[PDB]
Every structure is written in structure tokens, then in C-alpha cells.
Write a protein that binds this ligand. Structure first.
Ligand SMILES: CC(=O)SCCNC(=O)CCNC(=O)[C@H](O)C(C)(C)COP(=O)(O)OP(=O)(O)OC[C@H]1O[C@@H](n2cnc3c(N)ncnc32)[C@H](O)[C@@H]1OP(=O)(O)O
Ligand SMILES: [Ca+2]
Length: 157
């Protein structure tokens, strides 16, 4: 089993290494810190035996709704990045991280909906999102550096 807890500054090196091992979207150090610092309550890590084995990094912002079409702003949470190490996959880790984060986006940050981007061929990640009620909103052509399209995916809170 694993345990879950909020991310801490000391976790950031392990988080960065996890991000580089599993994703081609490699955010710099300061980036992780400022999100930890601004949105920490929805920033979670999964721990196995004194080691961080996964994380979810959140963002909270004002913006326009992906759910309804309104001319006024609404409070949105964004899953900026999430990853679990290969060894610890299929154990519910990503699931529990995302529910943890979404609950915090709802209750700590008063978001009314949440969104994310995923590569159109990241089938395991898409499947995980759809299990958690996310729906495709938009295709963003050539969104990723390597040229792949993204789905903008969203769900209400
Ligand atoms: C928001 C963005 O940044 S998008 C990029 C997301 N991050 C990545 O792709 C990094 C590389 N991949 C990973 O780290 C992991 O595979 C993740 C994040 C996709 C999922 O990690 P996991 O801990 O294995 O998720 P979890 O075990 O809770 O999966 C739950 C459900 O998701 C689906 N799912 C997850 N992985 C797979 C897979 N390889 N194949 C098919 N379905 C899958 C399944 O329906 C699964 O339910 P089940 O195991 O009962 O059958
Ligand atoms: Ca992806």
C-alpha cells in the first residue's frame, strides 16, 4: 500500500525526477515551488516507504467556463500535471490523488469546475479521467512541443 499527503518543499526534488521520468513536459524548479506555494492544499504526493512515487500539481484561476457558455468569469481548478511511477501503477494511486486534489479545489479554493489537457493518444490517462467524469471539450491542434494534439477535458464540481 501507499499513503497520501500534501506536497512539501522537501518533496520537490523527488517530484521533479518523477516528472522527467514519466513526462516530456518538464517544468522547472521554481514552477513546482510557486504552485506548491499558491495552491498547496490541492498539491498531493503518494508515499511508499519514505519515498514519493507520484504527485498531482494543481492550479486555481479565474476564467471562462468549459461547462456552460457564460460571458462572466467562473472559478476553475486545473490539473497542471499528474504522474505515478511505472512500478506503482494500476493500484488506484492516480485515482486517489485526483479525488484528493479535486476535493480541495472544491472546498479550499471554491472552484466550480475543473479542467486539464492530455495528449490525444494518452489512452490510459484519458481512460482515468473519463472514469472520474471528465469529458472532451475541445481538440487543441499541435498543442504539445513534439506536435501532438491535445484534448481539453473538463468536469463540473
Ligand atoms: C494532466 C496531464 O498532465 S496528462 C498526463 C498524465 N500523466 C502521465 O501520462 C504520466 C505517465 N502515466 C502515469 O503516470 C500513470 O499511468 C497514470 C497517471 C496515467 C495513471 O496512474 P495509475 O495510478 O495507474 O492510475 P489508476 O491505477 O488509479 O487507474 C484507475 C483507472 O484508470 C484506467 N487506467 C489507468 N491506467 C491504465 C492503463 N495502462 N491501461 C488501461 N487503463 C488504465 C483504468 O480504467 C483504471 O481502472 P482499473 O485499474 O480498475 O482497471
Ligand atoms: Ca498527455
Amino acid at each position: 500500500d501507499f499513503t497520501l499527503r500534501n506536497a512539501r518543499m522537501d518533496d520537490i526534488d523527488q517530484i521533479i525526477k518523477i516528472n522527467r521520468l514519466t513526462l516530456p513536459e518538464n517544468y522547472p524548479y521554481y514552477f513546482f515551488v510557486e504552485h506548491l506555494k499558491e495552491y498547496g492544499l490541492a498539491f498531493f504526493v503518494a508515499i511508499v516507504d519514505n519515498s514519493v512515487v507520484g504527485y498531482i500539481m494543481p492550479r486555481i484561476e479565474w476564467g471562462f467556463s468549459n461547462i456552460k457558455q457564460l460571458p462572466s468569469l467562473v472559478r476553475k481548478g486545473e490539473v497542471v500535471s499528474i504522474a505515478v511511477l511505472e512500478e506503482y501503477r494500476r493500484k488506484g494511486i492516480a485515482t486517489t490523488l485526483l479525488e484528493a486534489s479535486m476535493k480541495s479545489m472544491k472546498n479550499d479554493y471554491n472552484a466550480e469546475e475543473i479542467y486539464l489537457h492530455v495528449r490525444v493518444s494518452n489512452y490510459p490517462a484519458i481512460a482515468l479521467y473519463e472514469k472520474l467524469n471528465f469529458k472532451k471539450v475541445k481538440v487543441l491542434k499541435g498543442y504539445y512541443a513534439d506536435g501532438e494534439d491535445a484534448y481539453l477535458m473538463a468536469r463540473p464540481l
